[PDB]
């Protein structure tokens, strides 16, 4: 777990009002509600969240893949080899602070509830 | 409402999923020129941005 | 212009080895082979590539707009008012070096090439 990664994950972890983890275990998960959201640095020095859709629709996939201004809205993609459908999205370590990191995560588990 | 949870092992494995390099030394190749197109392209565009 | 953004304009060309633009407001746009590509700064202090396409490569959730291990992996999304579809990438201009974004840029370009 790099120095940046780990400072990003206590500062969500803060924001969360839990327990700060853990082993330094690189990929984390979180259920927030309904969704079960994952954590990683990918690649080096970026901060990746994904979740994976159980039977949403995708009606509005092409819509929700189109930039908006901001950054943080999640891409809908799929794994190729698996046919599972995965939320996502991704920014880079050496530019943040705690509001931006819970905003990402915000953003993941918005999209995940709105879609379609 | 926030609780974590262990992490599946294809979630393990997705989080570090990598793909071949792509497009080494393409645009050396193809080349690359100042474009100046329609004038409603780059005032649609303005406006899809904005 | 943002300065910032100027001057990472300056260090693509000076990659492409085309002549220095003039502050132009806006969107400026290369022709790359027979790919027309644009760049424009969004939202502000990041660099946003996208071009075009038509009806080829697959704007849903797809193999495209999986993410990878390299963060300027075009994204293919589409308008729904116009129905455009757009496959785009963006940097932060805080991580955009002169290598980087020529990088940004030949990603865009490679699966354009791709995509049918």
Redesign the interface.
């Given at each position: 777990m790099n120095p940046l990664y780990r400072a990003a994950i206590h500062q969500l972890?803060l924001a969360?009002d839990?327990?700060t983890?853990?082993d330094e275990?690189?990929?984390?998960?979180?259920?927030?509600?309904p969704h079960?959201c994952?954590l990683?640095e990918?690649?080096t020095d970026?901060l990746?969240m994904?979740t994976?859709?159980e039977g949403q629709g995708?009606a509005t996939?092409?819509?929700?893949?189109?930039?908006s201004?901001?950054?943080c809205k999640p891409?809908?993609?799929?794994?190729?080899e698996?046919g599972e459908?995965?939320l996502?999205n991704?920014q880079?370590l050496?530019?943040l602070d705690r509001a931006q990191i819970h905003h990402q995560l915000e953003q993941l588990v918005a999209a995940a509830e709105e879609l379609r | 409402?926030?609780?974590?949870?262990?992490?599946?092992r294809?979630?393990?494995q997705?989080?570090?999923?990598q793909e071949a390099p792509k497009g080494e030394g393409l645009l050396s190749r193809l080349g690359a020129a100042l474009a100046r197109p329609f004038v409603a392209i780059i005032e649609w565009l303005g406006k899809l941005l904005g």
């Amino acid at each position: 777990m790099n120095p940046l990664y780990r400072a990003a994950i206590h500062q969500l972890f803060l924001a969360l009002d839990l327990p700060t983890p853990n082993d330094e275990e690189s990929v984390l998960s979180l259920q927030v509600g309904p969704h079960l959201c994952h954590l990683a640095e990918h690649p080096t020095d970026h901060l990746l969240m994904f979740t994976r859709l159980e039977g949403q629709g995708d009606a509005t996939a092409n819509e929700q893949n189109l930039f908006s201004q901001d950054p943080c809205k999640p891409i809908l993609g799929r794994d190729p080899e698996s046919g599972e459908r995965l939320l996502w999205n991704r920014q880079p370590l050496q530019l943040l602070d705690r509001a931006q990191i819970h905003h990402q995560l915000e953003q993941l588990v918005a999209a995940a509830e709105e879609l379609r | 409402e926030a609780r974590q949870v262990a992490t599946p092992r294809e979630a393990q494995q997705l989080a570090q999923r990598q793909e071949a390099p792509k497009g080494e030394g393409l645009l050396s190749r193809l080349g690359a020129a100042l474009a100046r197109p329609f004038v409603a392209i780059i005032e649609w565009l303005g406006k899809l941005l904005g």
